[PDB]
């Protein structure tokens, strides 16, 4: 059998017995075949519905208990066996099981002792009976329990970011049934940025919270903080969803969606105007975004007809998410909480944003059609259909009840997108996966991302360039090194994926679905320098981390034995020139121009050998994979030599060698040389323009301002005529016009 054999039988008996009671009375016999087809989240709901009509069947109840046993849910599995046993006493083997499971999970309660006594009298002196007697004894005493707790706490003091240890603390709390403390630590720990990124931790967070909701202690205590803990569950669901989609398989991700949607439906009823309501807002968006990402995962593997229909469906999901407004940040109790919530908002808009675009670039105003066709409530049922099995009740599912009203159907603006990215760099703890994804998403756009601003958001007060550039010791790491690094990581990643699909769209993959986009070497470096800078390294591992960083420094700076293809160096050079040439301050201009000249000075010897059609000495285990896809050709050499000579002149100008800079700039009639010529002619005029000074000099001073006007006009004249020149502008067109207005009013 398969999935089709069992889900096709749905229509077989659906067409033979359609009333709800007989439809639910077939649930056990529906569930009979899903247990065989390895479907346990589905088989569970099928049997559970038959139990809703046939609540007195000992077979069905046991079958669910045996299914909860495969799910390892002891509390749920035990209860199921109990019902089957109390209905039918002749089920001896279940009395053993109950006694067997009660002693394995927790002995603190006498209920485990009681069921063991009965199990003994049903199986006099069987081999298992003693085994259970020894198991019950095993559990430690009060002093023993306190002993374990102190170890974990003393261990958590110095290792608060350890996923496993914090999990054990929740398990120890749960073993003493002081669940309020379990969630309390769970809540105070959802502020930890590292734990929030741990799949296994978030899974523990989801359980310990649900257990508390149903726990007797939650009701007795009070109903005031009930909302507070409820917020964390939704947050946990969002994080858990992001992680499950990336690592886990198609089946597990879909299953998590149902728990998410159940929570949303159970939460919306309360409403209000507090943190919980605001959280529901932002989490609502995440749901669709992840649901869209989830949709695209299935279609990727599937056929083309399903792909378009699914991508169509996903486009709507991402759209719904993007539309959701920025959550009300002021409305939260604390600074940490509100900053977190906003961070996630930026992540939602950024991820969904790029996806919305990459899907809309496929066709012309493709977005408009998506809304005009599927914004209809018919789409809501087509979405629930593709995502879920229709058998589940469509009433308590948030997806089926949401009011999809007035979808903006407006593609995102790049400027808004940039500030979403920059604000969400810390969303996924700055994993090189996160940034390499963003960097690639911007690789197809006409506006470039503010990488230098990303790094400032991550490593604060890390100097742009280190004074002690002579050595490669990693105490001298600089935001330039990182900026130079990410550029290669993305330039490398793009080429690798380009090669992959050629053998077999690359932009269209969502962030969770795609696999590692960087080499484990690169990832190891970023994780090292990150742990080092943020001061979350290990005294023992300090020396190792430190050396791991040191190894790659000499390559990021193009020093001895750099594994750098000439194309990647050139890309670094120009990418830094234009990055620096647009900066306002001199400090930053100088630095970025300096590095750009540096890399240029390293390439030109290679280009000259390449200019005469010779061979480059290939590298030894390079840090940035070489590719013949972008190997430099003679057709482009003279251009680089020219573009480099500009970068030289620019630095000469910034240092003070104006005479040589102008002499060089004027030699090449380039749009960029105008903006430089103009910018430096304007400065010679403005300073001397109004102080008392020789009249003859004043005339010469005005003469420069006249040249400034002319060069700015040449820029705009050539700019308006041709689009290719508009892209060559070292600064925005409107910025060039802005100066001109002031230049002439002077």
């Amino acid at each position: 059998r398969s999935k089709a054999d069992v889900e096709r039988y749905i229509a077989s008996v659906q067409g033979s017995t359609p009333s709800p009671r007989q439809k639910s009375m077939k649930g056990f016999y529906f569930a009979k075949l899903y247990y065989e087809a390895k479907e346990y989240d589905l088989a569970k709901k099928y049997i559970c519905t038959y139990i809703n009509v046939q609540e007195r069947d000992p077979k069905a109840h046991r079958f669910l208990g045996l299914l909860y046993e495969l799910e390892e849910n002891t509390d749920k599995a035990v209860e199921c066996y109990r019902r089957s046993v109390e209905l039918n006493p002749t089920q001896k083997d279940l009395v053993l099981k109950i006694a067997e499971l009660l002693c394995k999970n927790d002995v603190t309660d006498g209920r485990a002792k009681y069921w063991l006594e009965r199990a003994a009298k049903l199986f006099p002196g069987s081999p298992a009976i003693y085994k259970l007697k020894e198991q019950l004894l095993d559990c430690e005493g009060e002093d023993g329990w306190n002993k374990l707790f102190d170890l974990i706490q003393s261990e958590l003091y110095v290792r608060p970011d350890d996923v496993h240890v914090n999990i054990r603390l929740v398990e120890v709390y749960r073993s003493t049934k002081r669940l309020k403390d379990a969630v309390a630590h769970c809540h105070e720990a959802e502020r930890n940025i590292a734990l929030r990124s741990s799949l296994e931790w978030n899974s523990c967070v989801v359980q310990t919270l649900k257990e508390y909701l149903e726990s007797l202690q939650c009701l007795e205590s009070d109903k005031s903080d009930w909302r507070a803990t409820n917020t964390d569950l939704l947050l946990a669901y969002a994080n858990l969803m992001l992680l499950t989609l990336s690592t886990r398989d198609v089946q597990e991700s879909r299953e998590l969606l149902q728990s998410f949607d159940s929570a949303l439906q159970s939460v919306k009823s309360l409403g209000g105007n507090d943190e919980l309501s605001a959280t529901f807002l932002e989490m609502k968006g995440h749901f669709y975004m992840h649901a869209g990402s989830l949709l695209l995962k299935m279609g990727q593997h599937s056929s083309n007809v399903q792909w378009r229909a699914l991508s169509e469906l996903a486009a709507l999901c991402y759209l719904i998410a993007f539309q959701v407004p920025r959550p009300k940040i002021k409305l939260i109790k604390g600074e940490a909480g509100q900053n977190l919530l906003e961070m996630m908002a930026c992540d939602r808009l950024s991820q969904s944003g790029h996806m919305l675009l990459n899907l809309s670039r496929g066709k012309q105003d493709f977005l408009k059609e998506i809304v005009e066709t599927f914004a209809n409530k018919s789409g809501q049922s087509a979405l629930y259909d593709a995502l879920f099995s229709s058998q589940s009740p469509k009433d308590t599912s948030f997806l089926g009840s949401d009011d999809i009203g007035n979808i903006d159907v407006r593609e995102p603006e790049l400027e808004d997108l940039t500030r979403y990215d920059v604000g969400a760099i810390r969303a996924h703890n700055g994993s090189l996966q996160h940034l390499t994804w963003l960097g690639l998403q911007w690789n197809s756009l006409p506006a470039l991302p503010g990488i230098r601003k990303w790094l400032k958001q991550l490593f604060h007060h890390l100097p742009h360039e280190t004074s002690r550039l002579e050595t490669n010791a990693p105490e001298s790491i600089c935001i330039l090194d990182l900026e130079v690094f990410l550029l290669g990581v993305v330039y490398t990643s793009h080429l690798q994926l380009k090669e992959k699909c050629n053998s077999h769209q690359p932009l269209c993959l969502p962030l969770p679905v795609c696999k590692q986009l960087c080499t484990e070497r690169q990832k190891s470096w970023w994780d090292a320098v990150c742990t080092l800078i943020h001061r979350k390294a290990v005294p023992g591992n300090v020396a190792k981390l430190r050396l791991l960083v040191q190894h790659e420094i000499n390559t990021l700076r193009a020093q001895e034995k750099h594994g750098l293809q000439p194309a990647l160096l050139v890309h670094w050079a120009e990418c830094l020139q234009k990055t620096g040439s647009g900066l306002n301050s001199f400090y930053d201009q100088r630095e970025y121009m300096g590095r750009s000249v540096h890399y240029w000075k390293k390439v030109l010897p290679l280009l000259k050998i390449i200019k005469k059609k010779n061979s480059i000495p290939e590298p030894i285990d390079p840090l940035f994979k070489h590719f013949h896809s972008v190997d430099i050709q003679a057709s482009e050499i003279v251009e680089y030599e020219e573009d480099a000579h500009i970068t030289f002149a620019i630095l000469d100008a910034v240092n003070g060698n104006i005479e040589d800079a102008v002499t060089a700039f004027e030699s090449i009639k380039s749009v960029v040389s105008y903006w430089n010529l103009a910018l430096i002619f304007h400065r010679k005029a403005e300073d001397i323009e109004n102080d008392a000074l020789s009249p003859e000099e004043q005339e010469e001073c005005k003469n420069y301002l006249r040249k400034t006007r002319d060069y700015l006009i040449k820029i705009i004249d050539d700019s308006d005529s041709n689009l290719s020149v508009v892209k060559k502008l070292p600064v925005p067109l409107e910025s060039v016009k802005e100066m001109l207005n002031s230049v002439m009013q002077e």
């Epitope: 110095v158 007060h461 105490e475 080092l532 001061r535 005294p539 023992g540 300090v542």
Partner: antibody, heavy 129, light 108 residues
């Protein structure tokens, strides 16, 4: 261009709490170990806390163990000395100082710092009801 | 616990003198000792690090030395600006301890 500035001092009642701030500039705060050294009037230097350079494992003198808490923030490029259950004996001038990773060695049984190069101006803390 | 016993507690000398201050480590300690100068009310400044290495910027008349478990600060030719209090400092495993200090008073 390189300096350490202490703040967050002032007087407080016994059994109260304070928080000192050691703001650093000019050296990469990540690779530096941060220390606090108090000095009562007419008395000598007493080491009270330390933070290993690249990770930040704490270590306190038994005279303040469990009451004080020293921390380091990379984003704010500043270290702090949280002080609780302050006693009249804690009345003293509190200095902070760094020891680079070049001078910070980890050994079996604990770590060692060769010396304290950069010191701060020193913020006064008075504890008296 | 390790202890750095500094001697003398208070010293009196005049300009040009060759002055000596000594600190004894109770347990056998490795060469991870330092020396500091603290003028009245101002901050302590580092003179010698790693027992006998001079901190950059310190005058050359300062020199550190060790003999067994006894560390010694030596000023070849005392100057008027060197009339201040001095301290010795050891760094053992996860612990730092200072000597009681030595005041250098002008003799008359």
């Amino acid at each position: 261009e390189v300096q350490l500035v202490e703040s967050g001092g002032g007087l407080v009642q016994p059994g109260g709490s304070l928080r000192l701030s050691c703001a650093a500039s000019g050296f990469n705060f990540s690779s530096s170990s941060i220390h606090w050294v108090r000095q009562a009037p007419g008395k000598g230097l007493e080491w009270v806390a330390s933070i290993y350079s690249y990770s930040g494992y704490t270590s306190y003198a038994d005279s303040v163990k469990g009451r004080f808490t020293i921390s380091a923030d990379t984003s704010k490029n500043t270290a702090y000395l949280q002080m609780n259950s302050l006693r009249a004996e804690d009345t003293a001038v509190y200095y902070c100082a760094r020891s680079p990773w070049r001078w910070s060695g980890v050994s079996d049984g604990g770590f060692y710092y060769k010396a304290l190069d950069y010191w701060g101006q020193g913020t006064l803390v008075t504890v008296s009801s | 616990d390790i202890q750095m016993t500094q001697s003398p507690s208070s010293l009196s000398a005049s300009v040009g003198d060759r002055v000596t201050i000594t600190c004894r480590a109770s347990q056998s300690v490795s060469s991870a000792v330092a020396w500091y100068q603290q003028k009245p009310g101002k901050a302590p400044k580092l003179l010698i690090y790693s027992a006998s290495s001079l901190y950059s910027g310190v005058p050359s008349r300062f020199s550190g030395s060790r003999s067994g478990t006894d560390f010694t600060l030596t000023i070849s030719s005392l100057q008027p600006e060197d009339f201040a209090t001095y301290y010795c400092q050891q760094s053992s495993s996860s612990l730092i301890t200072f000597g009681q200090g030595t005041k250098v008073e002008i003799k008359r």
